[PDB]
Design a binder for this molecule. Structure first.
Ligand code: MG
Ligand code: MG
Ligand code: MG
Ligand code: MG
Ligand code: MG
Ligand code: MG
Ligand code: MG
Ligand code: ZN
Lengths: 60, 121, 171, 66, 111
RNA sequence: AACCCGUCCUCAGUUCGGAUUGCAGGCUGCAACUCGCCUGCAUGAAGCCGGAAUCGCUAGUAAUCGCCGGUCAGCCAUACGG
RNA sequence: UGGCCCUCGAGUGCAAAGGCAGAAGGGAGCUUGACUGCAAGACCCACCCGUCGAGCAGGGACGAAAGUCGGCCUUAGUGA
């Protein structure tokens, strides 16, 4: 199980938002190798709830 | 090995397969020699040249005076006269063909001076 | 005593002299030195860094210009190498350095070689170019190398005539 | 030439031969010292034949007896 | 290259430092100093004019170059002419009447 | 001769070690190439006290220094006998 | 390592075919579009599946700009 699917969570979204626009959190999913990339994987991707691109980082 | 003229022509073809002159956005290409500059504005669909501005024109040859080759100040004048020559024709948009040479240098001054007023690119 | 001997001696004395030798219809047909490529190959460069980082400085003082870590064009197991690893040490000499380097060649390093009896005149490749091989570099007043001289000559005769004027003692 | 990635190469670095300035060249070092410069070495002044035969042994036979 | 196209050490005396030269033995090292009538000081501390005066006088003998060439042609003289002594060099064996039954490890090793 | 006095060499294949080879000479002798002994120079190998094993020596002995002689024109004697 | 000659005979992570030479191959710099919400119209075809896709809004990367990008030269790397 060298390769593994990694889950990316938005850094900036909050739980149980009381806003009028949209409530929730952005979350993508991609591939990522462990040995070839022992560090985490943070990327600036789009967030529909935050109306902008934000740094989505590994939840685990 | 390859010479400067051969490598120049290769750099111009790789550019030309992306930029394309049209009636709505003609093609502005530049040719710098060892002693002169030269510019054309072409609608590639019609294969016709709409405007042009050279170093050998009388309206500017009397003004500028260079000994060795055309300087950055010369390019600022070519971009100025060609712009006034374009607006009278009734066209603003244009695609910039850098003639295979790098954008940095006199080519930048020609584009900025031409972009300074009138044209949209 | 002058600043640049070869650059001044060439344009003033040699070009009228070499033109009369072959009777060229134009002055631009004369040959001239384009560059001097100094190679130094070490197969065991991938092992140590001190021997690598040191030898790179040894040639730099001889030439006044940094060498370059030349990499392999392809991997092969016969000599236990890999692609992308450094194998050779090279540098390019052009302009005034090639003349200043040649002054340090014929007069400083080449005479100090042990048991010297002139360089082989048969080292020409057949298109005006010339090469030299060394075992040591301490002959330069400061392991071997392959000095590759380039020239715009078509045949080797004018090259042999060209190089012989700037010293280059041939047997 | 890039700035910080070359030695302090210069021009007209003198070359003494026991205080004798034969000529000057460009180099990194301050000065040089030579004894095989141009003329001290025999191959340059010589015919550059690079071939000797040890002409004859008869000379050893006849001259020694006399 | 200190003198004679060889780098000699600078710490030893003069008499016992010229001997590293291929053409200078133990007697010639003394004859040079005795001709120059100078004192046997260190190698580094020696003056320039005095050290210069050595560089001119040492070149009179078969120091290097022609020395190694004068020998190799002499050994080559015996091989092509095929003397008795010449064949023994080709065989890698001595030529001065040595016995070859239980000795001569030098040349047998230097095959 | 070891040895005493004095200068230098300061742990290095070295001012340790002197094999191998070239050149130039001498003596013996009718004769010195195979196959003698020496001189003058220049080259300067291996070798940093040595496995398993093994030899000598109980007093001027062992260890170490040099001298002589016999056979002999000369001498391969580093031997033999003192 | 230098030069000359023939010119696509190499290479494109892996099988093969097809394609690609100032390139889809080989480097460098900045980057995450390996996006969100869609989608006219087509290819395929028992059914269930599968494939290409102009163009529109949003918020963005690269580029001086024009323009390009909804993973990889294409086709296996998968399970109602
Ligand atoms: Mg010696
Ligand atoms: Mg040893
Ligand atoms: Mg020791
Ligand atoms: Mg023993
Ligand atoms: Mg007893
Ligand atoms: Mg192919
Ligand atoms: Mg590419
Ligand atoms: Zn967010």
């Amino acid at each position: 199980d060298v390769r593994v699917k990694v889950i990316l969570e938005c850094t900036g979204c909050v739980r149980k938002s009381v806003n009028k626009g949209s409530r929730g959190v952005s979350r993508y999913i991609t591939q990522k190798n462990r040995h070839n990339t022992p560090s985490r994987l943070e990327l600036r991707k789009f967030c529909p709830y935050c109306y902008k691109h934000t740094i989505h980082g590994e939840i685990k | 090995a390859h010479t400067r003229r051969e490598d120049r022509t290769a750099r111009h073809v790789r550019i030309r397969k992306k930029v394309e002159g049209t009636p709505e956005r003609p093609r502005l290409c530049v040719f710098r020699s060892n002693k002169h500059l030269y510019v054309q504005v072409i609608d590639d669909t019609k294969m016709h040249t709409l405007a042009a501005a050279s170093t050998m024109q009388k309206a500017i040859s009397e003004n500028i005076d260079y000994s060795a080759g055309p300087t950055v100040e010369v390019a600022q004048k070519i971009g100025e006269m060609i712009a006034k020559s374009c607006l009278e024709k009734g066209i603003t948009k244009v695609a910039f063909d850098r003639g295979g040479y790098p954008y940095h240098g006199r080519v930048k001054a020609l584009a900025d001076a031409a972009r300074e007023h009138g044209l949209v690119f | 005593e002058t600043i640049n001997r070869l650059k001044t001696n060439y344009i003033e004395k040699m070009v009228p002299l070499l033109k009369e030798e072959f009777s060229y219809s134009n002055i631009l047909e004369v040959p001239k030195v384009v560059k001097i490529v100094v190679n130094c190959g070490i197969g065991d460069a991938s092992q140590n860094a001190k021997g690598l980082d040191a030898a790179i400085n040894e040639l730099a003082l001889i030439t006044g210009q940094r060498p370059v870590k030349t990499k392999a064009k392809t991997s092969i197991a016969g000599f236990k190498v890999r692609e992308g690893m450094t194998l050779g040490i090279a540098v390019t000499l052009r302009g005034n350095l090639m003349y200043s380097f040649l002054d340090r060649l014929i007069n400083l390093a080449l005479p100090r070689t042990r048991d010297f009896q002139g360089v082989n005149p048969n080292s020409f490749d057949g298109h005006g170019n010339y090469s030299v091989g060394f075992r040591e570099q301490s002959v330069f007043p400061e392991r071997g190398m392959d000095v590759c001289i380039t020239t715009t000559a078509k045949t080797d005769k004018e090259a042999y005539k060209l190089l012989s004027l700037m010293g280059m003692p041939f047997r | 030439r890039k700035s910080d990635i070359h030695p302090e190469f210069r021009e007209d670095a003198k070359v003494y031969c026991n205080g004798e300035l034969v000529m000057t060249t460009g180099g990194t070092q301050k000065d040089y010292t030579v004894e095989v410069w141009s003329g001290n070495h025999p191959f340059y002044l010589g015919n550059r034949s690079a071939l000797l035969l040890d002409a004859d042994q008869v000379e050893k036979f006849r001259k020694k007896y006399g | 290259v200190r003198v004679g196209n060889v780098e000699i050490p600078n710490n030893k005396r003069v008499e016992y430092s010229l001997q590293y030269i291929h053409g200078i033995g133990r007697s010639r090292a003394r004859q040079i100093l005795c001709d120059l009538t100078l004192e046997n000081k260190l190698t580094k501390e020696l003056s320039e004019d005095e050290l210069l005066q050595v560089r001119d006088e040492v070149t009179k003998y078969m120091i290097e170059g022609d020395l190694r060439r004068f020998n190799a042609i002499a050994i080559r003289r015996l091989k092509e002419i095929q003397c008795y002594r010449g064949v023994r060099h080709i065989q890698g064996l001595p030529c001065r009447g040595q016995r070859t039954k239980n000795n001569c490890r030098t040349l047998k090793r230097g095959k």
